[PDB]
Coordinates of C-alpha atoms in Angstrom, one line a residue:
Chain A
X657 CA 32.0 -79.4 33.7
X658 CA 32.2 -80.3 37.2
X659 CA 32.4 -76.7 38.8
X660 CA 28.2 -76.3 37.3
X661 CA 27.5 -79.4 39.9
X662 CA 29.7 -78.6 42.9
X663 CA 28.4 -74.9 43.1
X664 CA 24.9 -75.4 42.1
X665 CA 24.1 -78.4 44.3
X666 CA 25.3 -76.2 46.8
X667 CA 21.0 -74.6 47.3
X668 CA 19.9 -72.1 49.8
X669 CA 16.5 -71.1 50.9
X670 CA 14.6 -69.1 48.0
X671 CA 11.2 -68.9 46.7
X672 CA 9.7 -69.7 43.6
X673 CA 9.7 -67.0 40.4
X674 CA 10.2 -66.9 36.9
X675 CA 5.9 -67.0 36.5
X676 CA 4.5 -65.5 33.3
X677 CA 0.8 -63.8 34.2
X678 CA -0.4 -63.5 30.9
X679 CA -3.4 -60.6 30.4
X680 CA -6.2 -61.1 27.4
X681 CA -8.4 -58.8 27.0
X682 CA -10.7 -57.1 24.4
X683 CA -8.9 -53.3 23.5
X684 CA -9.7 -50.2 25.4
X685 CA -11.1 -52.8 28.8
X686 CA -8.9 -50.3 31.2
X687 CA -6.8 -54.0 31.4
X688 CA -3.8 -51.4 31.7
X689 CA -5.6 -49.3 34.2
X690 CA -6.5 -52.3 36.7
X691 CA -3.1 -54.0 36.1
X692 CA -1.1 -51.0 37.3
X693 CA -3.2 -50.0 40.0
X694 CA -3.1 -53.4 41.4
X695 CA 1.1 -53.1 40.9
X696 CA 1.0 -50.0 42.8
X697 CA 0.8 -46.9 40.5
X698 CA -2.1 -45.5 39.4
X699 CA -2.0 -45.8 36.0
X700 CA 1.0 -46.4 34.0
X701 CA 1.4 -45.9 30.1
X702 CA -1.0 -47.5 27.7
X703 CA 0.4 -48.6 23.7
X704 CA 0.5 -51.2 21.0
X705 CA 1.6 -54.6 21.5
X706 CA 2.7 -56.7 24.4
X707 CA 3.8 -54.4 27.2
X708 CA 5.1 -55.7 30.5
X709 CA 5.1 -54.4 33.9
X710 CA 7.0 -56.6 36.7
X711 CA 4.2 -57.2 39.6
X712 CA 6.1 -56.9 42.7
X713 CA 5.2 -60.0 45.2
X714 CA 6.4 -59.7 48.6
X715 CA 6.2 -62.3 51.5
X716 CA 6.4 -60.5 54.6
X717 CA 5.4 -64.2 56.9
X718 CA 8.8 -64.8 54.9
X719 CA 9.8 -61.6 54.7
X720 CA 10.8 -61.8 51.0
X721 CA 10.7 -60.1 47.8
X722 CA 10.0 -61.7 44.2
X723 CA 8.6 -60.4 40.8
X724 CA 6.7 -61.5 38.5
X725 CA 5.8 -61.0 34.7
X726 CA 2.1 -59.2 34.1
X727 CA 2.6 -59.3 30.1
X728 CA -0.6 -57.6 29.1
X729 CA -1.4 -57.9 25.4
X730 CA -3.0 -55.8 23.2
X731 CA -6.7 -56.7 22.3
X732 CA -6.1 -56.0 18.0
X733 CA -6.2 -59.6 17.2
X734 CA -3.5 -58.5 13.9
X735 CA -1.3 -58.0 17.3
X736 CA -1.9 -61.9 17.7
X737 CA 1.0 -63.5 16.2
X738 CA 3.6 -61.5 19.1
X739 CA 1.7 -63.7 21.5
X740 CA 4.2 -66.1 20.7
X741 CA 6.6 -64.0 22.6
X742 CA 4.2 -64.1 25.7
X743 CA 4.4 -68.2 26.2
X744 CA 6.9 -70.6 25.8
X745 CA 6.7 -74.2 27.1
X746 CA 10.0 -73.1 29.8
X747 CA 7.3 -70.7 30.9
X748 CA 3.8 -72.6 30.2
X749 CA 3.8 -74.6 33.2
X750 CA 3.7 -71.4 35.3
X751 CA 2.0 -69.5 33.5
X752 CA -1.3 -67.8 35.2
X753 CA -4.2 -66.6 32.2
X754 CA -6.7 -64.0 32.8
X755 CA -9.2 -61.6 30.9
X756 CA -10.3 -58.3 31.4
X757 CA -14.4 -58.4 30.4
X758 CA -15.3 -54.5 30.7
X759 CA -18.5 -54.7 32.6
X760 CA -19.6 -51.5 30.9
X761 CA -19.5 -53.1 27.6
X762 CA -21.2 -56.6 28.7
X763 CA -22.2 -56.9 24.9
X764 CA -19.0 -58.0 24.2
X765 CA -18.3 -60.2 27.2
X766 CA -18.7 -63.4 25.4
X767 CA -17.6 -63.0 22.3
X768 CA -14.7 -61.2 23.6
X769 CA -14.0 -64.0 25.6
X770 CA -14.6 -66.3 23.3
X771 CA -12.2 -65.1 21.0
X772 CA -9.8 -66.0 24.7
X773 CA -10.9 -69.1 24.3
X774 CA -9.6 -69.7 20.5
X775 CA -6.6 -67.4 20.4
X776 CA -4.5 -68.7 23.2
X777 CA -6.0 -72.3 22.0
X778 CA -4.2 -72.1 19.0
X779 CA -0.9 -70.8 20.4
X780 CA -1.1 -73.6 22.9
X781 CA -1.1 -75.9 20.4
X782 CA 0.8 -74.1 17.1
X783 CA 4.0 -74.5 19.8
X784 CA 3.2 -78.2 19.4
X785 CA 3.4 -79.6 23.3
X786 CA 4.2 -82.6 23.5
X787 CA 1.6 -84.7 24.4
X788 CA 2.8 -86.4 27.6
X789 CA 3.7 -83.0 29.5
X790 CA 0.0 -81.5 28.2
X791 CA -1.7 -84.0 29.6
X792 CA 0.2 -84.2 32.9
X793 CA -0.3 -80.7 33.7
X794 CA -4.2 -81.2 32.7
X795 CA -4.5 -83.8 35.1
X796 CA -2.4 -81.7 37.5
X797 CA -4.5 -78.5 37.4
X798 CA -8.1 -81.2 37.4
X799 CA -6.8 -82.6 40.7
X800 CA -6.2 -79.3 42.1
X801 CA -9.5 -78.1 40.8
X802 CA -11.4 -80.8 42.6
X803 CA -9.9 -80.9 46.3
X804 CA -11.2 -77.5 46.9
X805 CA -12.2 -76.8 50.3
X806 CA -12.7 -73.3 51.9
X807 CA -15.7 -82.2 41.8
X808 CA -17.0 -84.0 39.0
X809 CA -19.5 -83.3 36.2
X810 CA -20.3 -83.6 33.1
X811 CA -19.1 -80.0 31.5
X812 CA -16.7 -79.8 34.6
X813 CA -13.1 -78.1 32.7
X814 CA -15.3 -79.7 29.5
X815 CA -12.4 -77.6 27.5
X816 CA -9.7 -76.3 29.3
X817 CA -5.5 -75.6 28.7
X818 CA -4.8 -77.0 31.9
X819 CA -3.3 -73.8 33.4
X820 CA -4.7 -71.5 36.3
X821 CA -7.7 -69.2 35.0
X822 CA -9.6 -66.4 36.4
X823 CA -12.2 -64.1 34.9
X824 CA -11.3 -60.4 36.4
X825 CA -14.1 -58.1 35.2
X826 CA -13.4 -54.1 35.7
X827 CA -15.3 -51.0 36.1
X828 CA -18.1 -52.7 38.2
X829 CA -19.0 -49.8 39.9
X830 CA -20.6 -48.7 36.2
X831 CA -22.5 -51.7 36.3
X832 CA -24.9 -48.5 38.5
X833 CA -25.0 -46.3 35.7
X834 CA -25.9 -49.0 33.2
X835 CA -28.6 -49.9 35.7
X836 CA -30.4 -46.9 35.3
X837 CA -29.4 -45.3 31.7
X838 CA -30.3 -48.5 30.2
X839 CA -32.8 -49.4 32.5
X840 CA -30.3 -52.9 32.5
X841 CA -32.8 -55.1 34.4
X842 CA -31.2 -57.2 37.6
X843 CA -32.3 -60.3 36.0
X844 CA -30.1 -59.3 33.0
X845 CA -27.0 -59.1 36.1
X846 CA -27.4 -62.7 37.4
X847 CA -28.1 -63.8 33.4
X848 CA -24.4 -62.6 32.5
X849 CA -23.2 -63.7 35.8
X850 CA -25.0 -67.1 35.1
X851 CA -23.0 -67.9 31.4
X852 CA -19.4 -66.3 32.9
X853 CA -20.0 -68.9 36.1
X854 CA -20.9 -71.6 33.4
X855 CA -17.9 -70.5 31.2
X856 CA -15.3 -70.4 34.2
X857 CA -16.3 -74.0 35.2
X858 CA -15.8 -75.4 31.6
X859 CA -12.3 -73.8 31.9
X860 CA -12.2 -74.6 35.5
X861 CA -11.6 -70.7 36.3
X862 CA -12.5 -68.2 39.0
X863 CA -14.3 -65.2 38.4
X864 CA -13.6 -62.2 40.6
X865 CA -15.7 -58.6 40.1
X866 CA -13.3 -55.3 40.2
X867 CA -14.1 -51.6 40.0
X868 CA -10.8 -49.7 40.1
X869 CA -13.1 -46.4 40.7
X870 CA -14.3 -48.7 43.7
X871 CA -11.2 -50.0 44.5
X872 CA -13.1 -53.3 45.2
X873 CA -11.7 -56.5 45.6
X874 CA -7.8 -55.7 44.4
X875 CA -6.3 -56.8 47.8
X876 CA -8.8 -59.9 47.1
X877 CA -7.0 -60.0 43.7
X878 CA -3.7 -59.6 44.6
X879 CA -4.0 -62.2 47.3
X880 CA -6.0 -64.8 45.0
X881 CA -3.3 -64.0 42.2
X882 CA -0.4 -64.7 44.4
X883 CA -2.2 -67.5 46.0
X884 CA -2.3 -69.4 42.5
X885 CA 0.9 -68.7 41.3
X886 CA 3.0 -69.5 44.5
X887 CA 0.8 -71.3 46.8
X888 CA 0.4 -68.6 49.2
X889 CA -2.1 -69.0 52.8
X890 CA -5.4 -68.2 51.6
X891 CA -8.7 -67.6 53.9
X892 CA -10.8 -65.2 52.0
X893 CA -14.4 -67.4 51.2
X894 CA -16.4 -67.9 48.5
X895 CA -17.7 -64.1 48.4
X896 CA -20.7 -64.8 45.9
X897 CA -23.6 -63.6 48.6
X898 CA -24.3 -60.0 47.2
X899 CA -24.1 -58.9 43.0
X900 CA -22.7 -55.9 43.6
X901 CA -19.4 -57.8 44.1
X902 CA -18.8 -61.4 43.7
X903 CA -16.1 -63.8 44.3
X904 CA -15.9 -67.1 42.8
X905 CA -13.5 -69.5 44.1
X906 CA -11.7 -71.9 41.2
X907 CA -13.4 -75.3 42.6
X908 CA -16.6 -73.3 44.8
X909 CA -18.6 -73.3 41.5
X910 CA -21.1 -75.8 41.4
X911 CA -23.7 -76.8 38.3
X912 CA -26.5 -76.7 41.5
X913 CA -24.6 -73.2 42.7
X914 CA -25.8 -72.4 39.2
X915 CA -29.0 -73.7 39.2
X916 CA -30.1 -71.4 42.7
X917 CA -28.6 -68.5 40.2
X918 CA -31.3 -69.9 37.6
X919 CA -34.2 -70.0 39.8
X920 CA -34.0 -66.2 41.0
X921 CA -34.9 -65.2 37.3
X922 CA -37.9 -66.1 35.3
X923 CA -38.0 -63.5 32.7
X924 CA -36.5 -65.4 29.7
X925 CA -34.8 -69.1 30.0
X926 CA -30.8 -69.3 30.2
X927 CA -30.3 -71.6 27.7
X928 CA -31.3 -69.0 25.0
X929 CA -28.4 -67.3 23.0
X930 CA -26.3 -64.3 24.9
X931 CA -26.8 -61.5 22.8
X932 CA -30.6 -62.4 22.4
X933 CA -31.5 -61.9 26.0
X934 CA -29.2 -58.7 26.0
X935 CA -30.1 -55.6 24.5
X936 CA -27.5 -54.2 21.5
X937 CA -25.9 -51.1 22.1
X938 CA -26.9 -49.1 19.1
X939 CA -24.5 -46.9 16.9
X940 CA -24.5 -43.2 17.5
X941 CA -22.1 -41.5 15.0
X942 CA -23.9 -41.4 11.2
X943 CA -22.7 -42.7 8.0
X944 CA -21.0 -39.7 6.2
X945 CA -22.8 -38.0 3.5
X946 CA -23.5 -39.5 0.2
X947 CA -20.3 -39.0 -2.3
X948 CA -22.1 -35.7 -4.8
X949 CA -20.2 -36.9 -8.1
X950 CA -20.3 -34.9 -10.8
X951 CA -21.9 -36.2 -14.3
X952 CA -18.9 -36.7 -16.4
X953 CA -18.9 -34.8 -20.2
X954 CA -18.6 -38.0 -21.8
X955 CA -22.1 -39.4 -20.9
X956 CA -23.6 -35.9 -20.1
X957 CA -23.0 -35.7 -23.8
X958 CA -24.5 -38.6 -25.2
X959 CA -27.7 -37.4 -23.1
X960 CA -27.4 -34.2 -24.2
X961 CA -27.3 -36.0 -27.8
X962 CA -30.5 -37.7 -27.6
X963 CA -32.1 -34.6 -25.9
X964 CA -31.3 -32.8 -29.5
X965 CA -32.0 -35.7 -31.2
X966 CA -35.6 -36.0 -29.8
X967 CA -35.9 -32.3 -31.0
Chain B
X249 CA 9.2 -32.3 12.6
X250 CA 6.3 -34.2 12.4
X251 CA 3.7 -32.5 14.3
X252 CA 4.7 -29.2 12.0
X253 CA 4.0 -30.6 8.8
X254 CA 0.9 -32.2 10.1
X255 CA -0.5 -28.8 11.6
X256 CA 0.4 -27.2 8.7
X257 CA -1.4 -29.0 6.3
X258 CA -4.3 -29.1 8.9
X259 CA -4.2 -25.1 8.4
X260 CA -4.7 -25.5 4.6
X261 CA -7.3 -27.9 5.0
X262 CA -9.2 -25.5 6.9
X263 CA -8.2 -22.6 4.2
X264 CA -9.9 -25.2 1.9
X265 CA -13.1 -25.4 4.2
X266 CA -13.2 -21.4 3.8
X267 CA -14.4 -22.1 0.4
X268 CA -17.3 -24.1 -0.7
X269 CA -16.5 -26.9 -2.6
X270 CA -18.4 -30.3 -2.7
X271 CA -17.7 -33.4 -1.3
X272 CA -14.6 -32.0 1.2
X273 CA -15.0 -34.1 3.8
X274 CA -14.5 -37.7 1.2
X275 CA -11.6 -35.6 -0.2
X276 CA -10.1 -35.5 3.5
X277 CA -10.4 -39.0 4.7
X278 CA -8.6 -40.2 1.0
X279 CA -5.8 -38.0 2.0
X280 CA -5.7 -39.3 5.5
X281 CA -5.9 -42.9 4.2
X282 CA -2.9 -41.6 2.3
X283 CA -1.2 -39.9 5.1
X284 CA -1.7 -43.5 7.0
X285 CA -0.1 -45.5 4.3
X286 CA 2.6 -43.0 4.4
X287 CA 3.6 -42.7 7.9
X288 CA 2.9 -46.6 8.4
X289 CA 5.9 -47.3 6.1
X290 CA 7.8 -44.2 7.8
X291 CA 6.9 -46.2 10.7
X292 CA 7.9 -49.4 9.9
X293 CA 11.5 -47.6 8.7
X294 CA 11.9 -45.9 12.1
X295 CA 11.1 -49.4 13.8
X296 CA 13.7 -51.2 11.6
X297 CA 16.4 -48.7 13.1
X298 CA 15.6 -48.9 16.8
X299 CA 15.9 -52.4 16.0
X300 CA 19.2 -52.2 14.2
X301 CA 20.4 -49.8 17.1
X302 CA 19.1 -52.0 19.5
X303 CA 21.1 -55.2 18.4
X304 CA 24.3 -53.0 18.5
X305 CA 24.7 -53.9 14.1
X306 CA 23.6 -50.0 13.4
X307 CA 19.9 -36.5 6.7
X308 CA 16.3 -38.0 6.7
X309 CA 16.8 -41.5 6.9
X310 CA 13.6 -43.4 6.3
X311 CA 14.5 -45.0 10.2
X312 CA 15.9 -41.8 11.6
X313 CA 18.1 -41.0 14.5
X314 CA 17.4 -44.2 17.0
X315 CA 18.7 -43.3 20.6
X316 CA 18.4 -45.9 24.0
X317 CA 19.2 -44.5 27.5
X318 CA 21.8 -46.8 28.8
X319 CA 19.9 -48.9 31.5
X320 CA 22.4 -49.2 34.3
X321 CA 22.3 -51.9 36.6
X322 CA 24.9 -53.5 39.7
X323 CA 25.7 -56.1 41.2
X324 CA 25.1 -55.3 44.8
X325 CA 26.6 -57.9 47.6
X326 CA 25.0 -55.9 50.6
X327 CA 23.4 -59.0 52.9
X328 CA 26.1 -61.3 51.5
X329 CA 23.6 -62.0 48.5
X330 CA 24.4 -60.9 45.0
X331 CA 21.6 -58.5 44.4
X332 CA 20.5 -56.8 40.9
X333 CA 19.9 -53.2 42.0
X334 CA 17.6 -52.8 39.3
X335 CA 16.1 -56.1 39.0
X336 CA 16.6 -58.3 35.9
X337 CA 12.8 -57.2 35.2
X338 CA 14.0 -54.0 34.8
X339 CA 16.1 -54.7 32.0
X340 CA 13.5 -55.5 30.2
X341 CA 11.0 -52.8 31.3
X342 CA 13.1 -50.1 30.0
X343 CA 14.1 -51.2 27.3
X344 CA 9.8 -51.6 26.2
X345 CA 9.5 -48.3 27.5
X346 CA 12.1 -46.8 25.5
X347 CA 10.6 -48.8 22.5
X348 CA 6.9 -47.5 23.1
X349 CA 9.0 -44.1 23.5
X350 CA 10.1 -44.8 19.6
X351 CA 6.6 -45.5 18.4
X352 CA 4.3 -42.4 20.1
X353 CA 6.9 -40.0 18.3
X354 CA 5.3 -40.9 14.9
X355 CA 2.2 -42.5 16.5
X356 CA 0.8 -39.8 18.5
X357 CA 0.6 -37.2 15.8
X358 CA -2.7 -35.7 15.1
X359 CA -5.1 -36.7 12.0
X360 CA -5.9 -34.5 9.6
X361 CA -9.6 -34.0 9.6
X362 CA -12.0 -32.4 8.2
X363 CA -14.1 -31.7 11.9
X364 CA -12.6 -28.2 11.4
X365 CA -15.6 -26.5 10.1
X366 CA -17.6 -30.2 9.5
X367 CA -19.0 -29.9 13.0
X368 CA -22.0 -32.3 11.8
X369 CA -20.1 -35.1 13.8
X370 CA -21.4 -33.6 17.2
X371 CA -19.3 -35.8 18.9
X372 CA -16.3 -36.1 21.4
X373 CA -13.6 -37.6 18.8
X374 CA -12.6 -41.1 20.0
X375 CA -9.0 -41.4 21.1
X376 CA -8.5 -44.0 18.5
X377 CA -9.0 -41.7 15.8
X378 CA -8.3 -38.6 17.0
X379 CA -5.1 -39.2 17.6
X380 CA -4.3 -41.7 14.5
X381 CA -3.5 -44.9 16.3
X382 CA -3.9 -47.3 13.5
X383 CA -0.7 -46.9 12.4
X384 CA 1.2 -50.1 12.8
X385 CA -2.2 -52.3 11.2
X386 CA -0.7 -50.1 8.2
X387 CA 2.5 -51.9 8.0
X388 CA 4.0 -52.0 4.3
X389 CA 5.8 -55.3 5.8
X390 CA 3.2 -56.7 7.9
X391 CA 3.8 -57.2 11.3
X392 CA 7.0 -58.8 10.8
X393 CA 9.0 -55.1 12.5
X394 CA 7.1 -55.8 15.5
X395 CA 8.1 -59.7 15.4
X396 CA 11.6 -58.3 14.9
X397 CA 11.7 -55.5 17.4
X398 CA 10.4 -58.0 20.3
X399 CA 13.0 -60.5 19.5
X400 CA 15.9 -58.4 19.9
X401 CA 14.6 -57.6 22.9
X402 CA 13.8 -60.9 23.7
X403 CA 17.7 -61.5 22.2
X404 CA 19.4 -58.7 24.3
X405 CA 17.4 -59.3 27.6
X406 CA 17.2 -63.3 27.6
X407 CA 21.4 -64.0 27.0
X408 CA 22.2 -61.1 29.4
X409 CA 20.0 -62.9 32.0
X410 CA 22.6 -65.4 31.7
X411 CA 25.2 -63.2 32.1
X412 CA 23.8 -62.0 35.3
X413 CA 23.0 -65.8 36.0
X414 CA 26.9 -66.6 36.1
X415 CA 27.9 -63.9 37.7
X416 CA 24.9 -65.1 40.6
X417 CA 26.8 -68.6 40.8
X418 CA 29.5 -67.3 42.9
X419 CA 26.9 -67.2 45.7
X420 CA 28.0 -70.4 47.1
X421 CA 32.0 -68.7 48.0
X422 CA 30.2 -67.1 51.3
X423 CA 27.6 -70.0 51.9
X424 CA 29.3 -73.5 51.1
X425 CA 31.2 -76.3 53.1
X426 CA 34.3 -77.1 51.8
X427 CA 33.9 -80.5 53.0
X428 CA 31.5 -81.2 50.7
X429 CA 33.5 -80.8 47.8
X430 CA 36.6 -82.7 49.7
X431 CA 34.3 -86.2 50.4
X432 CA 33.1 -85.3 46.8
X433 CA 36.3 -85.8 45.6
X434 CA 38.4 -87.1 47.8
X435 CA 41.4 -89.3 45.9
X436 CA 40.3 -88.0 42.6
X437 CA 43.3 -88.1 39.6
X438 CA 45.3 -87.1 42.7
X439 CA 42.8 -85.3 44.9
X440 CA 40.6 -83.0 42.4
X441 CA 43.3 -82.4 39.4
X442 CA 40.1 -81.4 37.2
X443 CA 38.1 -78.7 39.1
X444 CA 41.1 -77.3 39.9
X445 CA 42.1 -76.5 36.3
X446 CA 38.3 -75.5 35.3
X447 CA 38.3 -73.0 38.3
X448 CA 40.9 -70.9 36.4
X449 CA 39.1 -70.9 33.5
X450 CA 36.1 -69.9 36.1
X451 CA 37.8 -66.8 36.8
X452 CA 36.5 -65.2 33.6
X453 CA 33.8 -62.2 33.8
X454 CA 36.4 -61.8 36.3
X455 CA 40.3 -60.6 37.2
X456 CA 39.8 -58.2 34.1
X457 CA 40.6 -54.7 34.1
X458 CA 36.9 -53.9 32.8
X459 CA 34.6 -52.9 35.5
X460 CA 30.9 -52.9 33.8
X461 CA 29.9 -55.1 31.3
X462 CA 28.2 -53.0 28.6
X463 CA 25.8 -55.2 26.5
X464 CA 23.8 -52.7 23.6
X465 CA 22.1 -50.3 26.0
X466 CA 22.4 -52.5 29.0
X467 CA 25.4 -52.3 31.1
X468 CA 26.0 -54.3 34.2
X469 CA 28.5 -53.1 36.4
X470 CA 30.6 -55.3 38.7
X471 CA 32.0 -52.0 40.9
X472 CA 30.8 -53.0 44.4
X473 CA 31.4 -56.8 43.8
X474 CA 34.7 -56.2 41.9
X475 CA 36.8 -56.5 45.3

């Protein structure tokens, strides 16, 4: 009626909310762990499912508070189909996508994130968007991909959805151990970080190390995550100078900034398949013992009838 | 209840393992593939009735005994803002909480094994089995409960977001010039003749001798805002 204009054109100051982070990530990743720790707590509770935890943003230059939605999904892809409770096109516009690679798993990385890059595919299209608004938003997110000051190619967002897109990967500080009980070779480090780089620029994302243990880079993470979701100041730059910890800008990755990567190792080419330059982790637990049947009486009989027989 | 039955037939599982009898350890992953059917569709039945008790349409009922902790939440006007006091978030938080509460009681129980005297697997035993997490991949409906139980969620949380959202139009009585409205509609019918009957109708979730809105397990309360 008229009362829904004359009190709502009435607008104040506010900030923008209602954003959906959404978390993929393959099962057991800590993805809980570093999502609650980078809320605030510790650790909260880990489960089944979709679970939700409201990330408190506050702007103290503005001196405001907001939430929004971390709705971390399970990694069981049979818990696929209640992804279609995590996006809807109210919230796809605003909706921020990330995945949790477990750097002490890196045998996994790609086909883990792989399996990223088909599910939420499929869910962005099975809710059938319309065409217009898809492509608006893709164009949308390439223009703010290429004014990035702290481009254009030929794989450049190659395949993307046309929403923000970063790459966190945890437990970095075990990237150490893996170092020396696998004897994991440093030219094995800047092959993995080679593909993610070359995977984040065909979905125009940015990749950002973590190590809850060493509580590395979560203020960079909050403040690159509130940064893309609400257009926040941000000054941190493109941290990519030492492997221990790396930052990647969405728009500082560059096919030549992958090339120098290239040149530093020599031991096998990149263009070779992932899980042939890196070594399989073998299985430990055995294969239970061999079923001991029991002959049955009807064909230990016959036996026994040609034993007598032959007699 | 649970936990007891498990245990105990853990302890005659082991009674068995006294003995010597062939192929034990076969013999006790059948019966736990039985025991996961079992408790998937006792699962599945306790999942239906936190969602029937969830939606508000709800003596060993396949679904059991659902109980929510009300999730209070007010309307607080301190800085002349309508604030949530638990934010909207909240209501939703809880509620998954309470949910995952609902799930761990029959999800968390201990599977029967045979590692009781079949130490060969020398081996810390992985969370996901020692604990028997693969209950809900055992669904006797599929995965429809958990497309259910979200969506009354996603029912009772989305609608009462509204409810919170009208209440939040009010704002504009402390920050609003009434001039606006009299050049908006200035010599109307006579001078607004329309707004002026809708507002009455306006003064619903309102002027009422209830105090908090009780929605399922949510209740809102209008007590600090009610004056």
């Amino acid at each position: 009626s008229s009362i829904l204009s004359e009190v709502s054109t009435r607008a104040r100051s506010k900030l923008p909310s209602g954003k959906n982070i959404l978390v993929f990530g393959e099962d057991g990743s800590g993805k809980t762990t570093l999502m609650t720790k980078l809320q605030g707590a510790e650790h909260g509770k880990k489960g089944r499912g979709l679970e939700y935890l409201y990330l408190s943003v506050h702007d103290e230059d503005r001196d405001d508070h907001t939430r929004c939605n971390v709705w971390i999904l399970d990694g069981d892809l049979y818990h696929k189909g209640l992804l279609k409770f995590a996006v809807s096109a109210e919230s796809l516009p605003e909706t921020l996508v990330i995945f949790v690679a477990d750097m002490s798993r890196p045998w996994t990385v790609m086909e883990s994130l792989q399996k990223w890059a088909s599910v939420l595919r499929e869910h962005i299209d099975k809710m059938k968007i319309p065409p217009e608004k898809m492509r608006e938003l893709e164009r949308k997110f390439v223009k703010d991909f290429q004014d990035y000051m702290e481009p254009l190619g030929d794989n450049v967002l190659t395949h993307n959805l046309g929403i923000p897109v970063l790459v966190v990967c945890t437990k970095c500080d075990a990237v150490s151990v893996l170092e020396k009980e696998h004897d994991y070779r440093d030219e094995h480090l800047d092959f993995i970080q080679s593909h993610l780089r070359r995977f984040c620029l065909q979905y125009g994302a940015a990749l950002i190390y973590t190590s809850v243990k060493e509580e590395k880079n979560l203020d960079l993470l909050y403040k690159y995550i509130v940064h893309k979701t609400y257009g926040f100041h941000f000054t941190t730059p493109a941290l990519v100078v030492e492997k221990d910890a790396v930052f990647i800008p969405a728009g500082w990755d560059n096919e030549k900034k992958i090339a120098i990567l290239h040149e530093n190792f020599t031991t096998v080419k990149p263009e070779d398949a992932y899980e042939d330059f890196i070594v399989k982790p073998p299985v430990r637990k055995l294969v239970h013992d061999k079923e001991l049947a029991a002959e049955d009486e009807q064909v230990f009989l016959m036996k026994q009838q040609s034993l007598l027989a032959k007699q | 209840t649970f936990s007891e039955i498990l245990n105990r037939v853990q302890k005659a599982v082991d009674d068995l393992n006294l003995h010597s009898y062939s192929n034990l350890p076969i013999w006790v992953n059948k019966l736990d593939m039985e025991i996961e059917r079992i408790l998937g569709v006792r699962l599945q039945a306790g999942l239906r009735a936190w969602t029937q008790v969830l939606l508000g349409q709800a003596s060993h009922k396949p679904g059991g005994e659902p109980k929510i902790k009300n999730v209070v939440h007010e309307l607080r006007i301190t800085n002349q803002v309508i604030y949530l006091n638990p934010p909207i978030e909240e209501c939703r938080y809880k509620l998954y909480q309470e949910m995952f509460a609902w799930k761990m009681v029959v999800l968390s129980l201990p599977r029967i094994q045979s590692q009781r005297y079949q130490v060969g697997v020398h081996y810390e035993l992985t969370e996901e089995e020692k604990f028997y997490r693969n209950a809900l991949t055992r669904m006797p409906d599929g995965p429809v409960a958990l497309e259910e139980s979200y969506s009354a969620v996603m029912g009772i949380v989305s609608e009462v977001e509204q409810y919170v959202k009208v209440w939040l139009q009010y704002q504009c009585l402390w920050d609003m010039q009434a001039e606006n409205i009299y050049n908006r509609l200035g010599e109307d019918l006579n001078k607004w003749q329309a707004l002026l009957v809708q507002i009455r109708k306006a003064r619903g979730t309102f002027d009422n001798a209830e105090t908090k809105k009780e929605f399922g397990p949510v209740v809102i309360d209008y007590g600090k805002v009610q004056s």
